[PDB]
Write a protein that binds this ligand. Structure first.
Ligand SMILES: Nc1ncnc2c1ncn2[C@@H]1O[C@H](COP(=O)(O)OP(=O)(O)NP(=O)(O)O)[C@@H](O)[C@H]1O
Lengths: 367, 347, 75
């Protein structure tokens, strides 16, 4: 049975192909001790335990902006994935890894090198996250809107191939949305500044926030009735109430000025993306905008994307926003789907093929 | 494994004549290994493939496949021979050949880089300074590096639609050009050479993103080149600029006729020209070579005792191998996509 | 300001222009004066083919500068 690990900017999603959810979802962060001597009597901590010991540890996000940057910490994440979470020996399972769009050549070779020479897998493959997300929705052509923890990508894909010339990247996603939520709830009176309070504000975000269909009437409705307010109960029992904060926060995705960013907005980058593609394929793209990842999970986001792209596109363009219900983990699910196809058994990179040509083989097999 | 892979690979709907040739040979290089005995069939197929001689080479492949039937899979030769009579080529869509020719342009350029002492291009400065129109700048720098000659050779386009019109007009091939006039603008691309902006590509074979021309075929041209030679990929049709190169070369040959190494040195130009025109995406191989080989241009060389090799190389093995992998990847992905979408229907 | 566009026959078309004017503009002015469709026009100055988006300033074309004009031959 083949493994599927989504190497995410803030969460690693790992599991077994054939299942339709990852078994393990844990913070993709490595912690080492802050002062020696918390070490006397035992080395390093990964994942859920390293957030529990944040105060005796110096956290590092080895994959903060979607591209893995620290290979010693990635080695340890993957080791924790295989041996603690899934509880398997990697020599015993072909392994499908995901990569970010526009992933350097060498980052791909180094992924392959580690998987064969450090975990001694029989087989492996590397697919682009967005492509997997498109596959899980039964398309092989569209534009995927991938918004995770540390990075968002708008990724046009034509007959399975992500187009390097038109992929747009954008360093605003959930981590930034969670901090803004912190900021504005503080301005309201409720103090959230500690790393422990940051954790509750992430819960408040994923449970109560939503996208306004138009920002202004929602503000007007907030300013003129109680209907939008929602009570939220903290861990120590205190109850607080969230008002326009509920939608002011995810609004940051269409108005990065809210955070000081002079960027465009997930709708403008989507259009900009589509317009670096050949005219002949834009109609297909516009009719297959696929939303994907944890940060597209806000109620109302499909409908506003519909509205805003309709405002940017030519007046006859047929426009579809596809936002699956499973899109929190649709990268991984497309991975699970792919690994399971029988025809995919002819496409693994084999242990044999690897020491015949070394890590550069990834370029000739995975594209 | 390999028997079932080529099986899947052959199921593809979009499989073209050049895809089949590469897919076939990959099978026989794995099945019959490097037994020397067939070493020359492999060598001959690659040489016929370069010369775009798909008919002869597909003929040679089935027939080799009959006369070695017990050595192979009867399942695989049946699909090979059943699929062959229905194989076409599509100049809009010749992706395996685009990637081959583009890798070949690099092999050719590097062969010239260790062959040429760059004296021919320094000698050629004078033939250009003589036949250039008045609005074209003279070249007065010395050509020290091969890029410096690459940019020089390319600047002959300055002669176009003026100096080369006398001998353009003696062609009967060139009126059957079929580049559409409709100006289409520029599309961004990260593939090199003659590849399509949208086609898959090995992720070590990318090039930095920049704009390139979209050009269309007229398709309503009677006897048009795209129609008569569908094996060659369309980039911009027949290369008119190469009459401009022939006006410069005619002058060069005239005033170096007694040169003993004249044949050596004219092939360095003709070939560097060919490599650069593919590498820069102006034209595919045949779009250049098929205006060069027309018999009224061939006189010019024959009467001066010059035999052109046309950039035909000793071996193309690396670039041929690389192309096999490419069509292998693409056609198994095709298979995988078909399994994928027929699993969603059933949900 | 004034410039001069010279054709292969050595006849010369003189044109009143603003240094802000693009090449799309000068080619259109030539069409209006002589009939030549601009997709056929190739303007040459200082040995370079002139590109449409750029302006005369961007090419340092002062007053009385001479352009050269070559017409494309196609089908
Ligand atoms: N309403 C919500 N429901 C569930 N998750 C949410 C919601 N809103 C935000 N999330 C955020 O969505 C992010 C989840 O990130 P995720 O999609 O796994 O990104 P990743 O780690 O970058 N992997 P990937 O998307 O494949 O690149 C977290 O910041 C979550 O807090």
């Amino acid at each position: 049975a083949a493994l599927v690990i989504d190497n995410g900017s803030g969460m690693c999603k790992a599991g077994f192909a054939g299942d339709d959810a990852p078994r393990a979802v844990f913070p993709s962060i490595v912690g080492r001790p802050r002062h020696q001597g918390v070490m006397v009597g035992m080395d390093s901590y990964v994942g859920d335990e390293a957030q529990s010991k944040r105060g005796i540890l110096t956290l590092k996000y080895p994959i903060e902006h979607g591209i893995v940057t620290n290979w010693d910490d990635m080695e340890k994440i993957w080791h924790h994935t295989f041996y603690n979470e899934l509880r398997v020996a990697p020599e015993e399972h072909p392994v499908l890894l995901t990569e970010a769009p526009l992933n350097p050549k060498a980052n791909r070779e180094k992924m392959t090198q580690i998987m064969f020479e450090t975990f001694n897998t029989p087989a492996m493959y590397v697919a682009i996250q967005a492509v997997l997300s498109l596959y899980a929705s039964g398309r092989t052509t569209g534009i995927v809107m991938d918004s995770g923890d540390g990075v968002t990508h708008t990724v046009p894909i034509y007959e399975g191939y992500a187009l390097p010339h038109a992929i747009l990247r954008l360093d605003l996603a959930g981590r930034d949305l969670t901090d803004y939520l912190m900021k504005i709830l503080t301005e309201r009176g409720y103090s959230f500044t500690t790393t422990a309070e940051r954790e509750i504000v992430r819960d408040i975000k994923e449970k109560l926030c939503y996208v306004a269909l138009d920002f202004e009437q929602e503000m007007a409705t907030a300013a003129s009735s109680s209907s939008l307010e929602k009570s939220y109960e903290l861990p120590d029992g205190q109850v607080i109430t969230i008002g326009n904060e509920r939608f002011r926060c995810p609004e940051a995705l269409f108005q990065p000025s809210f955070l000081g960013m002079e960027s465009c907005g997930i709708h403008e980058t989507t259009f900009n993306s589509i317009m670096k593609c050949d005219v002949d394929i834009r109609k297909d793209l516009y009719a297959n905008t696929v939303l994907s990842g944890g940060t597209t999970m806000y109620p109302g986001i499909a409908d506003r994307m519909q509205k805003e792209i309709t405002a940017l596109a030519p007046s006859t363009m047929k426009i579809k926003i596809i936002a699956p219900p499973e899109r929190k983990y649709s990268v991984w699910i497309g991975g699970s789907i792919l690994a399971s196809l029988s025809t995919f058994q002819q496409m693994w990179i084999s242990k044999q093929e690897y020491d015949e040509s070394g890590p550069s083989i990834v370029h000739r097999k995975c594209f | 494994k390999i028997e079932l892979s080529i099986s899947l690979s052959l199921d593809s709907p979009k499989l073209d004549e050049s895809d089949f040739i590469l897919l076939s040979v990959k099978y026989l290089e794995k099945s019959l290994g490097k037994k020397k005995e067939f070493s020359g069939f492999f060598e001959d197929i690659e040489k016929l493939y370069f010369k775009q001689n798909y008919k002869e080479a597909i003929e040679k492949i089935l027939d080799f496949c009959k006369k070695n039937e017990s050595l192979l899979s009867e399942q695989v030769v049946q699909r090979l021979a059943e699929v062959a009579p229905r194989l076409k080529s599509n100049p809009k869509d010749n992706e395996s050949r685009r990637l081959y020719e583009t890798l070949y342009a690099d092999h050719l350029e590097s062969v010239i880089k260790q062959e040429s002492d760059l004296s021919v291009f320094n000698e050629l400065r004078d033939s250009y300074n003589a036949v250039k129109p008045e609005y074209a700048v003279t070249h007065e720098t010395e050509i020290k590096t091969l890029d410096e000659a690459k940019q020089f050779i390319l600047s002959f386009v300055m002669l176009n639609d003026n100096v080369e019109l006398p001998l353009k007009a003696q062609s009967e091939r060139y009126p059957k050009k079929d580049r559409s006039r409709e100006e289409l603008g520029n599309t961004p691309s990260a593939n090199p050479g003659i590849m399509k902006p949208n086609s898959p590509n090995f992720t070590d074979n990318l090039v930095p993103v920049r704009d390139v021309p979209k050009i269309a075929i007229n398709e309503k041209v009677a006897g048009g080149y795209s129609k008569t030679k569908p094996t060659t990929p369309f980039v911009a049709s027949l290369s008119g600029t190469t009459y401009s190169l022939m006006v410069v070369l005619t002058d060069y040959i005239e005033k170096h006729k007694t040169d003993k190494d004249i044949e050596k040195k004219v092939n360095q130009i003709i070939n560097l020209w060919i490599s650069s025109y593919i590498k820069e995406g102006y034209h595919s191989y045949s779009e250049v070579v098929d205006v060069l080989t027309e018999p009224f241009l061939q006189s010019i060389f024959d009467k001066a005792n010059i035999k052109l090799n046309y950039g035909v190389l000793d071996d193309t093995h690396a670039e041929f191998r690389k192309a096999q992998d490419y069509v292998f990847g693409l056609t198994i992905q095709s298979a995988m996509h078909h399994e994928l979408q027929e699993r969603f229907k059933n949900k | 300001m004034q410039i001069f566009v010279k054709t292969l026959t050595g006849k010369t078309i003189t044109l009143e222009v603003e240094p802000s004017d693009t090449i799309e503009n000068v080619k259109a002015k030539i069409q209006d004066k002589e009939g030549i469709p601009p997709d056929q026009q190739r303007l040459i100055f200082a040995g370079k083919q002139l590109e449409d988006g750029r302006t005369l300033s961007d090419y340092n074309i002062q007053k009385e500068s001479t352009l050269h004009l070559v017409l494309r031959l196609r089908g």
